[PDB]
Amino acid sequence: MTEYKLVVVGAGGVGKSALTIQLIQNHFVDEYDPTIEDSYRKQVVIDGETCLLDILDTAGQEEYSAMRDQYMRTGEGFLCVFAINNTKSFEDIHQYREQIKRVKDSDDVPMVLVGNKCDLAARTVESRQAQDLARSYGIPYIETSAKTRQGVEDAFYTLVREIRQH
Ligand SMILES: Nc1nc2c(ncn2[C@@H]2O[C@H](COP(=O)(O)OP(=O)(O)NP(=O)(O)O)[C@@H](O)[C@H]2O)c(=O)[nH]1
Numbered sequence: 001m002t003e004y005k006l007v008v009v010g011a012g013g014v015g016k017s018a019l020t021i022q023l024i025q026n027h028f029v030d031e032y033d034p035t036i037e038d039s040y041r042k043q044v045v046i047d048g049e050t051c052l053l054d055i056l057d058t059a060g061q062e063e064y065s066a067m068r069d070q071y072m073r074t075g076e077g078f079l080c081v082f083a084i085n086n087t088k089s090f091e092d093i094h095q096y097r098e099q100i101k102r103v104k105d106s107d108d109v110p111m112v113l114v115g116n117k118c119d120l121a122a123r124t125v126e127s128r129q130a131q132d133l134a135r136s137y138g139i140p141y142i143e144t145s146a147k148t149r150q151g152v153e154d155a156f157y158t159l160v161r162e163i164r165q166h
């Protein structure tokens, strides 16, 4: 069956693992548990296609950068995650995107911009500005909460659908 290699990237603590675990295991992880690199494989039916989600969950820490180039090379699609209560993580997005283009030798890689932690009232990043950034890149913007599961499948499946269209 078709395997879709999805890579989850973004700054430390934005919820890359929480999103992935909510998708695979239907539980919200509220623990402190930094990632080095973890992979998940799940058989799913998306729009009637049977396929295998191979999800590469990456570290937000600069120390794991080289490890970064490796996985970025193999990915077909990228979830670029920031947290809506963390303006620095939103600024960092640009830098993850540019490294993705660099390692993929491509201006146009399947990608979704994900604003996570949308359950929180303490927003510092307006939806408007994330939407603008995503338009500027030519990719969808999806808001998610790993905590409430709002948007979680939407983010992953939308990325699959981007890959299908590339
Ligand atoms: N309220 C809320 N908290 C969240 C959400 N997603 C993650 N968190 C919380 O944020 C913290 C960090 O999440 P985690 O998934 O470990 O983040 P990460 O991006 O994978 N960290 P790293 O780069 O170290 O691996 C955890 O305490 C987690 O429960 C969310 O959608 N809403």
Ligand SMILES: [Mg+2]
Residues within 6 Å of the ligand: 016, 017, 018, 033, 034, 035, 057, 058, 059
């Ligand atoms: Mg993690």
